[PDB]
């Protein structure tokens, strides 16, 4: 018998392949992996894992966030691994080159009117496979309503809202009401 239970702490689960039935997402993941194997560019190491992420892990990035993020770097091509969406709140979108997995129709029209080019992952692989003049941007993962309720509400230091309506005095009106 060998003691393999000491300084060894189990194995971790990391998604090495996209669970997406979509043929397109699998075609890009395999391509970006082939580039990563031949040239270990870290931009491609992240893109390969950003295509394997879940919908919840891959949050939406609006053209308003992208304008703020690319404020000092208009020349650089934003690379988003999710959906680019319009923000009706921003009246004027700046010209920007954005590459995404999907652009909303309202967003796509706005970027083109601005003079920016909406690229696609296949186009990015053809022009800049290693990721030169490109920034890997991400939306806010913990923006989901589900994330806000995670935790034990009713614990003193929890600071989280309860899941149901509840509507009663005990436990809510301060530490003393418990």
């Amino acid at each position: 018998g060998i003691d393999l239970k000491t300084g060894i702490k189990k194995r971790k689960v990391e998604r090495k392949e996209p669970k997406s039935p979509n043929p397109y997402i699998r075609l890009l993941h395999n391509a970006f992996k082939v580039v990563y194997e031949n040239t270990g560019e870290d931009f491609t190491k992240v893109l390969t894992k950003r295509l394997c992420l879940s919908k919840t892990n891959r949050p939406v990035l609006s053209v308003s966030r992208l304008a703020h993020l690319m404020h000092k770097r208009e020349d650089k091509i934003a690379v988003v691994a999710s959906t680019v969406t319009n923000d009706e709140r921003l009246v004027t979108i700046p010209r920007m080159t954005i590459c995404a997995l999907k652009f909303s129709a309202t967003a796509r029209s706005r970027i083109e009117k601005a003079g920016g080019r909406c690229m696609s992952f296949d186009e990015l692989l053809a022009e800049k496979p290693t990721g030169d003049n490109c920034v890997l941007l991400q939306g806010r993962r913990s923006c989901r309503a589900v994330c806000k309720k995670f935790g034990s509400p009713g614990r003193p230091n929890s600071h989280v809202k309860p899941k149901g309506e509840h509507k009663g005095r005990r436990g809510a009106r301060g530490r003393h009401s418990w």
Binding site: P23, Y24, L27, L28, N30, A31, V34, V35, N38, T39, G40, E41, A105, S120, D122, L125, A126, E127, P129, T130
Partner: protein, 257 residues
């Protein structure tokens, strides 16, 4: 069912199992009892129908139509299309009211072998399906789509031939067995009106075209990616262990002197 009879448990002291028993002492009212209810009776309150979003349903019929125009998918689906001269097949067929007229048009555009594959395939199926009004199974053949033409009477009794109007293209007809790839004989009117039916969807834009596996392969062989590719460091040599002292040649590698 199974709760019509009157059965109550005999109880302890009778040297019998406690299951509910009839006045005779015959076991009753149990899943394991002959003449007994099902443990969980089949119920009509099951949700037989599922729901699909209109966009997703429209996406599936658009993709099935695209698969029809791919020659490889149609042959893979098992249709005989070698004789057919172009995919998609569009024919200026006037109002055909006679099966014999329809057979002649289908012989002259090469669809005859598919019509004969389905005629010679009629068999009595296996299982209790026969008893359930599903006795005969035939292969699926070409799908006629028509607009402003009376082509239905001519092709209706042809075996394996199914007909549809361009306004109500049905997915089950387009993808038999969930497999897309239907040989579709379009009439000139039907094909011409296909771009008008898609406009009639008040607010639907056809999904935007994407790359194929072949396109991805071509990019992976393109000069830009090859220029980025860097050669890897040479691998390590594992070499299975041998006793060094066993031979002088073995000893030399570890100790040259």
């Amino acid at each position: 069912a199974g709760v019509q009879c009157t059965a109550h448990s005999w109880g302890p002291g009778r040297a019998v199992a406690r299951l509910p028993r009839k006045h005779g002492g015959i076991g009753a009212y149990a899943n394991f009892a002959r003449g007994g209810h099902m443990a969980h009776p089949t119920t009509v309150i099951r949700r037989w129908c599922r729901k699909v979003n209109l966009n997703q349903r429209r996406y599936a019929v658009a993709s099935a139509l695209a698969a029809s125009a791919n020659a490889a998918l149609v042959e893979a689906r098992g249709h005989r299309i070698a004789d057919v001269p172009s995919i998609p097949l569009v024919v200026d067929t006037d109002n055909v009211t006679k099966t014999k007229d329809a057979l002649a048009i289908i012989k002259a555009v090469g669809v005859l072998r598919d019509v004969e594959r389905c005629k010679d395939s009629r068999h009595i199926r296996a299982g209790r399906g026969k008893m359930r009004n599903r006795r005969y199974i035939t292969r699926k053949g070409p799908l006629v789509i028509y607009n402003t033409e009376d082509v239905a009477r001519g092709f209706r009794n042809l075996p394996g031939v199914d007909l549809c109007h361009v306004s109500s293209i049905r997915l089950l007809e387009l993808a038999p067995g969930s497999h897309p790839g239907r040989l579709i004989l379009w009439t000139k009117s039907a094909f011409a009106s296909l771009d008008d039916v898609y406009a009639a969807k008040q607010n639907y834009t056809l999904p935007r075209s994407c790359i194929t596996q072949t396109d991805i392969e071509r990019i992976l062989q393109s000069d830009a990616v090859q220029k980025t590719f860097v050669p890897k460091r040479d691998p390590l040599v594992i070499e299975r262990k041998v006793d060094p002292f066993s031979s002088k040649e073995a000893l030399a590698r570890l100790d040259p002197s």
